[PDB]
Symmetry: D2
Subunit: 370 residues, 4 copies
């Protein structure tokens, strides 16, 4: 029993993105969906929170909202030309922020809140008010570039919070581990030339951005050696993800000695996700959380923040999220994941598993960790 | 330009299955979905048909319905105790046909129609009225056992049609190739001891039934050598599926010399499916159709029937289906798959590809085809 | 058994309108809907067609599509400034055609088709190819003004067809009876000064446009006496609507002696509609169709066209539509409306009924028909 | 600024009812809905709560849950044969509690909670812990009979709470005013022979139960004069409902002198509801709440509890609910109902209004209040 913060706000569930057929834009040869048409849907996030409430976990956590991120907070990462364009589109009823970047009315102010929840989570943990913290930040941040929206992300949530903590709370070295199944291209870009932040991304080889693996992208100038990409094979499951973490990430954290670990916590590597091809189950996410909590215990006095990114499986993500929040709080509810055993049976056999283990061995050797 | 039959009936879209959160049954810790709750949804199938209509393809096909399969047709595969129980549940408003087998009111008569469309497709092609044919059979059939519903399947559609054509149309040897991403366990069971039907299943290793691969299950007694399972690795994409077909399936058809090829045609290996982890795109399905049409040209005077099975990606399956129907008819519409290039970029790199190629080489050697 | 045309096209179901919470625009204090968000939804229209197919009625009808209405057809009603603006918005991905007028990508070409179905229905009946005809025209037309979209209507479907038949088929006098529950303000405006068309609207007093009754709006100049508005009381049911028709509309048709009767056929006076407060059931719509078919038998050699307008009750409109198509074709299927008896029991008691009868008496006296 | 209790629990939103097309059961000629299929949907209730949160009202209220109603609580109203049957169906995965009474897995325990929220609301107000209180009780109660489920109601929520307060808190006379648009037949039956409770129902003449008005049903034996039914005319709006309240209900409360007023608070008389034909807007519900709060100020030291019943308009009910909670708390947020002015314009003209006023005059004279 740690004191665990859960930062959320009902207004984050109000952001919308127009009419899509799953995640395809309607029009041309894409027929409008007969029902639901939300690209980045609030339902997964709300269902996680709803399950935390009925399981009895929520009253045992420290619940918080936050003030939105200020214009000054945003300007540590983003230029005003981008910000002004995003706000213009938001203020005028929603629309497109260049192609494939759909937002809705009031999305600007809801993105600032999202980023503000991450800012406050980082601060509460840094000041010792909380041992650790989870931010239910929607819309997500990890694909966002300084001057370009991408992958449903409009502001760089984690970098905004980190930059703000560097300027106002004397934060030093920080490691950002991104286990959303997609590549954290926005985080990578922002800290590419910087040695005061270690950015690690585990992701499906080639998934999004499409065709990017990135094992050879290590950082530039002072930043060289401070960016790690682990492109796992599509189809990998629990054994592979946990081995990448044991074999690459924990050793890399040990070498870098951070003052704070931040997880970019997506659940879209879960076995039922339509936006990737990985095979994780809720125990996978429980075990990964355990491993990074333990690292944090060893390295930075238990200081761990998690910020929600992706996950599109509407009925399965809540179990994965509850599992994380259970591991992070050290409280186990009575909930039993009704798919766990089914997904355990689907996991890749030893041939694939050994092959992926070998690929991860080669990566750790390439990064000087073996 | 072949004369291509498309067998469908509006009533097949009326079958329902109760309230699910995606495919999880509601209750316990599964919250009811805020919108749509259909496990096996008509929308994918209807959207395929809708796209065939607006693209201008439908008027170029021979459209047909059928009479439902008779009780006598069904009794060539299923015992009366199963049939009577299914009909009882259907007649009484729907319910459960043992656990994980949900059906709705009138589902019995709609399953008989579904099976009847497959019966008529097979017959029209066998009697030379059509060169080839597609049946939009819902509910699906390939998981159904003689006395047990499974995987959303209630009657064994393809075996019913095949048994009926053996009894009434002098049908001899027939090959059934199942490229739904899941294992065709129902077909396998029914023809396991039989040498007059070759059952081939390509499927994701371990997906459904969960934990089953099956490479060593080859047939029993007279049936030995007449069942082929190809458990591809989760994550495999276009290169792998087409290589399994070139390297195992076409050679196996050449050895067996059928009078008719039947595809159990699922689209749930498409890259956006929540019910498996494969990475096929619409050109994948186009190329696989081409390869089996060409085989049929070489072996049985072009006689090819395809029967719809699975596929859960609501916005993507229609493009995969249109692609098949375009390849089967030899008519190319103006439709361009808006995801094709994106999914091509996501395909596994050469390391994985060569590894899966090697695994398929070993399988073909084990089955005496190399 | 008449020869009855049913004009429809799958592409009309592809028009979309963005994200609404029922019919409220999302944003501000309107939370995005957790599921379906279609203001003017294709589902009601598709469900009607689906029910006509499974009941066995569809094969007994003459099914037709049409060529879209040409630019020249549209310019008999609409100026180019409006048309160009509508097309611009459509061509650029959808948007707003002034406030409360939402459309989607490609809506222009789908509106032209909709209007084209009405054009062709009118022509087939006028040339004696069909005895009568129904057009499943979506999007609807009756609220559209020459230069302004309103009430989900973008082109004036019926006026376009009528103007075209006047220019190319020597059409003379025509009566347009609008029993959509809302006021046919677009039709009224277009023919207000004209004595060659009688426009009658039955509508809920004050519903839409909001606050408009219109009993005193009779026509202007040559058009005076050629426009009839019957503002029925909210809450009125079967007895009232059928009495308005017996007492006002049929006598008005007798006085005017048309060559063609066109019904603007909405079903949003049905007892389950969220967009008005009337209490009609499927037998109501059956009886109203009978009365106008009989009038047409007496006045213009049975020449009757019906064009779909409104109706938002997703589960109930199909029964109302099937009823109309049954009455118009003279074919009764086996379908029994499962709500009919329930809605019959809800109908207003004699106090209200006599009061509304008296109000209609006064209207007919004001219009010189009693 | 009163101290206002809001009693709610996330688990009440988890109750489900199977697959319906709006509120029609699927099967036969009712096609399954392509999206959402919830007869009694949690979305209206959740959206009200969500709007209370984003408007800033929620933190100003006293938020509470409750213990479920005990078996002993339930047995003051319901016999064990009914209870055991309801629980059996709930425990076995859901089903039907006789015809048209659909429930889902775990619905029993969720109905007990619902009733428990009402019990606790009544108690907090009676013991002076709160000035007034609202219970977001789902599933609803007012149609439920002792031994029969009806109108989506499974336990008699308000009678259970009232009977419990009579047995444990020395509660005397209580008035129950039911302004859900449907008849409160369950409440009426339970207190029909009793003079210690005044049951008043305003409802749409004939709506549900279908064909029931009830002006002549006044009570039986000791209960005679203690039951008042006001069957308003379908179509009535703000003026009519508020006049029925001024002219019948407040005078009837003055005569009876209660210790507690309980509102059975449905919102299904709102102008956009598909389950009735009334024309109320959010200011209607605000004004009705004001009038009964003021009565309570005059008669029972401000003691007022409201228990949620019906309301099916998903986008409009939240505004009606927020309005009530604003009037009950005495706190006005910044929210402005985006439909208010539109619905004000739709209201029936003076002819209808005077006619309904006269009908209400006659009712008050029949009940000895004029
Ligand atoms: C962006 C994303 C996930 C983000 C997230 O979860 N961030 O981590 C996934 C892909 C499948 C997607 O939705 C998409 C849609 C349309 C399209 N084209 C029209 C070319 C290309 C891609
Ligand atoms: C059956 C199937 C696909 C069939 C098809 O497409 N046939 O080819 C897929 C799986 C994901 C599924 O839906 C499921 C649901 C619940 C569950 N448990 C409650 C244990 C276990 C599995
Ligand atoms: C237009 C229409 C029906 C048309 C049709 O059926 N034509 O006959 C109905 C009304 C209820 C409507 O949807 C609406 C929505 C929003 C709004 N404001 C935001 C002020 C005002 C009105
Ligand atoms: C029960 C109710 C509202 C309750 C509520 O809001 N309580 O106050 C409304 C009616 C419209 C309904 O849904 C219905 C459905 C089916 C049916 N038959 C199949 C005959 C008859 C009626
Ligand atoms: K870095
Ligand atoms: K990642
Ligand atoms: K075999
Ligand atoms: K297969
Ligand atoms: K006129
Ligand atoms: K009208
Ligand atoms: K009483
Ligand atoms: K009532
Ligand atoms: Zn992601
Ligand atoms: Zn499958
Ligand atoms: Zn209308
Ligand atoms: Zn009600």
């Amino acid at each position: 029993k740690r004191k665990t913060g859960f930062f959320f706000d009902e207004r984050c569930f109000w952001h919308s993105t127009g009419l899509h057929a799953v995640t395809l834009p309607v029009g041309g040869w894409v027929q409008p969906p007969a029902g639901g048409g939300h690209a980045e849907s609030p339902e997964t996030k709300r269902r996680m929170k709803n399950l935390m409430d009925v399981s009895g976990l929520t009253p045992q956590l420290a619940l918080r909202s936050a003030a939105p991120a200020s214009l000054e907070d945003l300007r540590r990462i983003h230029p005003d030309s981008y910000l002004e364009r995003f706000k213009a589109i938001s203020d005028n009823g929603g629309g497109m922020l260049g192609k494939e970047a759909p937002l809705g009315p009031g999305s600007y102010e809801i993105a600032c809140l999202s980023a503000g929840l991450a800012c406050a989570a980082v601060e509460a943990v840094l000041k010792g008010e909380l041992d650790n913290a989870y931010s239910l930040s929607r819309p997500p941040g990890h694909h966002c570039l300084p001057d370009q929206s991408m992958g449903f992300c409009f502001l760089a949530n984690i970098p905004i919070a980190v930059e703000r903590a560097k300027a106002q709370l004397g934060l030093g070295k920080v490691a950002i581990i991104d286990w959303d199944v997609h590549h954290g291209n926005g985080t990578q870009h922002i800290y590419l030339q910087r040695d005061d932040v270690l950015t690690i991304s585990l992701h499906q080889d080639g998934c999004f951005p499409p065709g990017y693996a990135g094992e050879d992208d290590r950082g530039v100038g002072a930043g060289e050696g401070y960016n790690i990409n682990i492109p796992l094979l599509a189809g990998a499951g629990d054994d592979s993800w946990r081995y990448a973490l044991e074999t690459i990430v924990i050793p890399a954290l040990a070498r870098f000695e951070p003052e704070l670990i931040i997880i970019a916590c997506g659940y879209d590597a879960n076995a039922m996700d339509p936006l990737a091809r990985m095979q994780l189950h809720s125990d996978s996410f429980r075990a990964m959380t355990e491993q990074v909590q333990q690292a944090a215990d060893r390295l930075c006095g238990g200081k761990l923040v998690m910020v929600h990114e992706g996950g599109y499986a509407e009925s399965y993500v809540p179990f994965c999220g509850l599992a994380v929040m259970e591991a992070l709080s050290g409280i186990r509810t009575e909930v039993q994941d009704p798919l766990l055993e089914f997904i355990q049976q689907q996991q890749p056999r030893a041939t694939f598993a050994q092959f992926q283990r070998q690929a991860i061995d080669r990566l750790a050797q390439q990064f000087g960790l073996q």
